[PDB]
Amino acid sequence: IDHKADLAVAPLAITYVREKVIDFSKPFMTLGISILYRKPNGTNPGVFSF
Amino acid sequence: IDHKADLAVAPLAITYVREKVIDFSKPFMTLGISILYRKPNGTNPGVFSF
């Protein structure tokens, strides 16, 4: 909003409050909230499972 | 570009060449190319099946 620089090449989410005053370019990447989970580790088999 | 119309909400890509002559907005959804294929059915074979 002041003037010490006119570029900021860093992940800076494009949002309404950040768009009211700042001016943004086209998005060069896409984001999104997604879950994370311990994958199925394995069968964990006991040979005496019979 | 003739100004005979105004805001035109419809499918319209944000490609480079189109942006050269007209202005755009921030996209209201994002999409790409994806594989379309038939659901598996399961008319399973002979010998192998048993």
Ligand SMILES: *[C@@H]1O[C@H](CO)[C@@H](O)[C@H](O)[C@H]1NC(C)=O
């Ligand atoms: C399952 O049934 C449909 C309708 O007969 C058929 O088109 C398809 O080939 C069968 N199997 C597969 C590969 O989905």
